Design an enzyme around this catalytic site. Sequence first.
Site, PDB file in Angstrom:
ATOM      1  CB  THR A 119      38.452  42.306  39.337  1.00  0.00           C
ATOM      2  OG1 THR A 119      37.428  42.108  40.324  1.00  0.00           O
ATOM      3  CG2 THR A 119      39.288  41.030  39.198  1.00  0.00           C
ATOM      4  CB  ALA A 144      31.569  37.394  42.811  1.00  0.00           C
TER       5      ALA A 144
END
Lengths: 202, 202, 123, 199, 199, 217, 213, 201, 204, 220
Positions: free
Chosen positions: H1, H49
Amino acid sequence: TTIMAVQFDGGVVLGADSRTTTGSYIANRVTDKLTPIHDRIFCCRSGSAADTQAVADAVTYQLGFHSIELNEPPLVHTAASLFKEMCYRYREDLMAGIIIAGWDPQEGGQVYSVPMGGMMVRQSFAIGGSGSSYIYGYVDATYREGMTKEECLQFTANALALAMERDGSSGGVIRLAAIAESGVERQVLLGDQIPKFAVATL
Amino acid sequence: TTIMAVQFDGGVVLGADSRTTTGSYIANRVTDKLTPIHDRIFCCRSGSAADTQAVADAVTYQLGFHSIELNEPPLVHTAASLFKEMCYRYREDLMAGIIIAGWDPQEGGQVYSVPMGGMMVRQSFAIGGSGSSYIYGYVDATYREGMTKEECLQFTANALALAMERDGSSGGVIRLAAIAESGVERQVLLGDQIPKFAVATL
Amino acid sequence: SYDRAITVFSPDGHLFQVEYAQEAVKKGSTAVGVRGRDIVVLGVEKKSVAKLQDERTVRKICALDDNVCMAFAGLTADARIVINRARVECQSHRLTVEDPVTVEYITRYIASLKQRYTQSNGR
Amino acid sequence: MEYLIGIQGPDYVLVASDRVAASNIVQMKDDHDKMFKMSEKILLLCVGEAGDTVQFAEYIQKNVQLYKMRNGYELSPTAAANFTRRNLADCLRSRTPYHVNLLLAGYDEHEGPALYYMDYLAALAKAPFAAHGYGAFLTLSILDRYYTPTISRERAVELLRKCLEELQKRFILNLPTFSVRIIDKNGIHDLDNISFPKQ
Amino acid sequence: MEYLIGIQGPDYVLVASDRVAASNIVQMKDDHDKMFKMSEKILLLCVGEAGDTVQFAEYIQKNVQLYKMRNGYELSPTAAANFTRRNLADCLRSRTPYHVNLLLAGYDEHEGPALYYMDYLAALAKAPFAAHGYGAFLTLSILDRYYTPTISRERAVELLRKCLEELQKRFILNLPTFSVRIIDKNGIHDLDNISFPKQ
Amino acid sequence: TQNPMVTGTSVLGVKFEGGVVIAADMLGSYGSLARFRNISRIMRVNNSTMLGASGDYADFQYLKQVLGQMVIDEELLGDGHSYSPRAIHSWLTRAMYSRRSKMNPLWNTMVIGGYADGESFLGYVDMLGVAYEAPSLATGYGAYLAQPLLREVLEKQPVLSQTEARDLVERCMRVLYYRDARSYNRFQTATVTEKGVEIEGPLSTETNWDIAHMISG
Amino acid sequence: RFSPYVFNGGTILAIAGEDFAIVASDTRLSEGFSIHTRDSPKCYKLTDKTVIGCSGFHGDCLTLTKIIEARLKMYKHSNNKAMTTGAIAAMLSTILYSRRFFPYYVYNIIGGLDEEGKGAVYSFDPVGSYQRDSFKAGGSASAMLQPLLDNQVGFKNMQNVEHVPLSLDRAMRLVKDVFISAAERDVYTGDALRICIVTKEGIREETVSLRKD
Amino acid sequence: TTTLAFKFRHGVIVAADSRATAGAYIASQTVKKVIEINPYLLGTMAGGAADCSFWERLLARQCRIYELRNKERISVAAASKLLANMVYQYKGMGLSMGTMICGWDKRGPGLYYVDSEGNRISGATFSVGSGSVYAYGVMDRGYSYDLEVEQAYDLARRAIYQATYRDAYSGGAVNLYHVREDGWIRVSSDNVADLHEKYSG
Amino acid sequence: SIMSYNGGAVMAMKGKNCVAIAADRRFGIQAQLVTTDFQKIFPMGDRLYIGLAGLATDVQTVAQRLKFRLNLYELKEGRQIKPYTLMSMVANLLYEKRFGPYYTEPVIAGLDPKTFKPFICSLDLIGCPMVTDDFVVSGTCAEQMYGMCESLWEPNMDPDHLFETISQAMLNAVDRDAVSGMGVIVHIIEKDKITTRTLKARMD
Amino acid sequence: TTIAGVVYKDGIVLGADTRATEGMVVADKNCSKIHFISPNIYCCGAGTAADTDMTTQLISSNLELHSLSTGRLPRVVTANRMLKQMLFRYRGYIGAALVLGGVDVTGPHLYSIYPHGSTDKLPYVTMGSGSLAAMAVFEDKFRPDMEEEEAKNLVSEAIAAGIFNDLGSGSNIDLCVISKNKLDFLRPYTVPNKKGTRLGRYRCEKGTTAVLTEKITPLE
Ligand SMILES: [Mg+2]
Ligand SMILES: [Mg+2]
Ligand SMILES: [Mg+2]
Ligand SMILES: [Mg+2]
Ligand SMILES: [Mg+2]
Ligand SMILES: [Mg+2]
Ligand SMILES: [Mg+2]
Ligand SMILES: [Mg+2]
Ligand SMILES: [Mg+2]
Ligand SMILES: [Mg+2]
Ligand SMILES: [Mg+2]
């Protein structure tokens, strides 16, 4: 420790050694491992002294109230149940190997085993404690159906004698007790009174 | 496992169960735990199959050479010594519980125990293996001095039967073998031939 | 704990305990307020200047935060409680949020406190 | 890693801190401020664990302010230090302990300048000068070396200047700028950041 | 913590390293050199564990030199990299493994400029540019961003200048000066250290 | 229970035309010790459902206690409603899962056997709450020694008769005795049919040890 | 000691087309190196246009399933309507998050139709993180099935190809292929493959066969 | 990410990759890491997440209530402060959250970085995620508070791309948002495949 | 895990009278790419190639040490190594390190030096070999790769329908593996020629 | 893996599945698990494939060297000895579980050898993850002196039990029959597992794969 109980017609026989150790040191060579729960109900204790003592007082308290409340002699099965309830419920925090034997005006002579897990089962005769492992074969080849309060009382004396011989965690004096409608008679077997078996030689 | 050996006048009796497990699975319910070391010398094995097999072949090799070299029947005490030497020397890497019994033109019938540690001691009769713990009391109250190749051969049959009954690590068929000057005769006790004892009921 | 319902509705739809509270307000030292454009003012009437008194220890005027303040009329003791509760809410509105306390927000808070106390057992 | 220093003079207290907010191998903030305003004459220099510093600092902050609104007058820097100490020490053996190390610099229009040091364990001590962080190890000896109970704020800003240069020399952590502030009878006054010409 | 960077041009190779010898919280040496002379056209940039760096570096060094004395001619930078790789990889599963990460910059009067990167595991790779250390994480993206297979040494020293400034900005480790050097058909040439005006 | 104490080994269950059958030896092991050789590890839960348990006997007795009260309770209403096999199996899954979620499991794997509405019920339940239905079930070692035989038979004849089935169970209870070191050749057989739940006294199996005489050869 | 979890295997796949959604899963339930049952599909009908597939720890899938069922009934009594595929997905997210510190070891895939009538697929991780996709697979064969779909259904890595819509017919065979290929490499996949097709007409089931090994 | 946000003259830029992994397995590359909190507030997704989505969604809920109760949009500081507070309670329990809360206050462009570690700081620029160190590199070399709108777009978009290059856990498509005084706009969303055949194509 | 430290993927496929072998090109250390031009397939004679996946150092080392042995073998024997024999040669080299093995699972692809016979196999890090008539995989995306292969491979394929098949298996598998990629390379070997192409792929 | 062997009237039968797994994924659908020792001796291997190979190859090699000197045909005890003494020496690190079977001047012999080095002389044995499943077949349907076909199928039935009931076993069933005069090495003996018929088309058509670099090289 080595505990044992046998059922004979109108009653029961109970036996235990008198050794209670902490490690390899005998803190009491004269312990009384047969505890009175009610007028004609007894239990043999093996495991944590503090646990078995604490549990037995608790059951005695529970049972004494139950009987006065009913104004009747308590069932042996009930006394067993009260141990089983505490031993199952607190199985993770107790180390108790118990045998409950006694006389019941309704069921007569009976012996119940309540081992570590908290399970409960009725048996012709029961054995518990560290030393018990050394007397299974013996006890299996010797137990006879139909023994007398005398044959039995002698049968456990041999089993406890043998076990006391091989187990370091067992020894001292053999305490006995027979219970039948008539009442309860407790005796002790010191030194020579204890069955003997010659140590194999040349 | 449950192994056992008894000494009687002109020879010895040897017995063992046939169970060999890995965990709780029986990889062989017909194992032969009585291994021939020499013409009239045998050993009972308990512990690591690989260890006891490897050690026994080694002793057999050692002893076979020793006797041809001397052109004479090997001593039972010697065979015991060769096991004791390997079992003491490699005690940290072996898991072998051995009993050596056999006939000696010079000492007659003899039984030696060589347990885990590697120590060696001669005995009237010896017992080893997991199941042995359940037959001490039995064996202590039953052993009689002066038994016959028959009484003995029956005495171990009972002991092994009892032990096989209580120990999960023991079971299968009972193998026996008697050794005396005359030679060696090995028999087996399948199903019904195995002594029986009624499981206590009501 | 005391659970009695203190404030309840009456036959015609009135909440006497509230109307009575309102009466106690009436028996209080007048208090006026005017909103200017550069300075808002407030003055507390009938200050019963007993002279043997002590000005500071009884001014019906108080500051709650650094951007707000208030005046009251009624039961003296009650005011104290409500004053110091808004004071607390002022600093706590800064710990939860980061910005300071608004004009209305704090007033709403006080109203909510009073309203609650007219619909809770034991109070 | 966070650095805190404070020097008490005869009529004031000078305090400084770095302005780096580190995370992993990078400086995530160029201008971070380790100081908290409690009163008009009090500052709380706070360093430590990620959430514990702000949470605790502001907590002691709003509670000191609340004291002001409730009584009209502020808490003496000496009284605030024992306050913050009480709470930190009371949370030490709680479910919500605060892992913070701090300095409490303040001026009392009656007691004079004061500088307090505090362990995350809540040990409280008064002192002429003190520091927190690895920097303290490389600079406390300097102060012992050049500090005099009468050093004037011109001197002090110089002694600080020394300690700060030392970190640019021996310390292995970047630390380019340092917030600086003083406190005297006239409150909390800012000061230019002590900076070093590095890209 | 040690930083190494190398940029290969079309006719040369520029390489640089920091000059800090860290220990605990302090810089123990202001002018430390991470580069080792192997040949006249070869350099071995070495970083890692306390003894492993020097020990290994000098070992590969003296063995390259020995090769010179035994055959008269030097080893090609490509041949040296596979040499050093052979040894490091051979010691990996030995009793004396060397925990070092390195760069091998060299010029072959037949193959041109070359820059090699190596894992302490002894994985060997050729590359236009490369770096070691935490700095690599903050600067490899820059190079990917401004590197062209034709960048001239004027450009290169500028691209390096960028990466170096980045560390003064994001990296939390001091790292004030950086040894710089170039290698072309005429050997190993020094260069001024890229320094930053910090006390 | 965090540490099982006295336990019971495998449990078997196969369904046939108009009923289901379950088998479980009467052994209560304590480690490697065949300690309690005469205890029932099967239970009758009302007229259309029976249960067999592997694992900690003490916990099993507990479930037996709670389930017994439940049946009694329901019988008191005599409202013409009564737990079906699927219902008992459903409750058990909720119970086992609930306890597993408190990190204090009832150390048992159980086989629920039932018959209701001309259909046969056979269900499995873990101490973790894994549950499912199937024509044949085998827990413990039985899942490695018995289930392969049971399936083998059913993949070539999905429908057995109470007799064909009882024949298979006996064959399996023999294989188990030969290979599971914690089994006992003394079991029980429970059967459920429109007629109800029947439990059969101490049984055993003919065992053949003739391979014992094949040491040398 | 005691683990409150177990891995039962089984994979789940789902694709969404213009006017249909497909949800497939093998039917094998295993533990260790054994098979509990060969007939245990992971697909379950929630409403007339919403199907869910759950893989992982069967203990949790069962509990989760029953929780979802009850909550739909509640929603119905409360709002007088059934839950839209999207709301069910939003809800399942919070249900998974309530066990954030003692997770439902579960990988769920929701397949159905959105209010606009089109096909929809939502994928979740054990603690509720989710999104909508064209197609997705979870479970053991997860990494086996995906790649073929990225290629075939997403026309990835293919130059000059015809981006034709996933005809329900082509989909149904893509599903059968990846599961048949997976059944070849993942010891957990096998026995059978049940598919659930969701359209305007309702939910239709189909059971293809797989290697019993 | 890899995520990032910086504020300049024209507001705040926010970009991010779209890759989600499970160990080495790419589980998805269509992840919307720019969380559309409100049409006036943006949040990023780094770390866990579910952890980021859930809490920020909760934040959206809290902001909406706030608005309805004060007929005013909540300030960036206030919002980020709510999130910080909600999360601090669980410090030590494993929540994993790296996010940047962006918007336009009555104080101008606003950008705050908030951690599950307890951090909460205002800054000019921020990068979060496994590929952050890379993005910092290109972003720092190119960031100016005076960048022109179309210049800022290229920078951010470039930074995220360069990261997807070096960081194995960053990739997919590159998302870009622009936060203007009125509201935020979803600038672009380009695959990395494309972005490559442009930065060098 | 050690094997996935540098990441990587390798594959071999069997056609009619041809053979293919491809490998990603990324050389990384955990999350970080370091190089895009990393060789993982090595020429071990004409019509015979070996592909090494796994730990970078052992990849290079196992290859170099294998060449050492391959060359001498060819200088003593008067020939060119037969595939089944090179496989047995690598099986021996790896197993000599049975209790401290190299971390690499090789893939062999080639044509008989004196026959048409296409040949492919893969091995254990400890030298256990596997020969198949379809394909073999190795690396951090074994699972992804098996996925493609069990759905794209056809018994007989001309060089071109093999190239297009193995090229799709890679690029698609490698695109669902975070540490494999940065370009793919393919080798298609025919009795007459060696076609070597570096496919167009993602660079993230 | 499921490997087994039985001793029948005229000789011996060895069985074995053909699955090989790297974790919980099938690497080889057709591994050869019945290894050749001598012309009259065969061994099934379960455990660490590589170990099962090399140990089996070594004993074979050493026996070809042995009989090459004695001029006689290898005995089973010899293979058993060599194998067990080696495995024992490695205290279990050579993960080889073997089912050894062959016919001697002394007859048909069936031994089971464990990785630690102990052996079992038995009429029927099993090894591997599927061994309990297989052993069930035997224990339920075993008879001494079975006929070739009556055993030749009891073994394929036990290797089958393993194949379906153990996730560690699958694919084909290989067999090996060894009698006083015959050696039938039945490779595929049964094949109860087939890959499901492809229901779609994916053949990659030339040109679909974008290329970035090409380079050819002509051979001779
Ligand atoms: Mg007064
Ligand atoms: Mg104090
Ligand atoms: Mg507190
Ligand atoms: Mg090399
Ligand atoms: Mg060396
Ligand atoms: Mg536990
Ligand atoms: Mg199902
Ligand atoms: Mg299978
Ligand atoms: Mg060639
Ligand atoms: Mg990738
Ligand atoms: Mg990437």
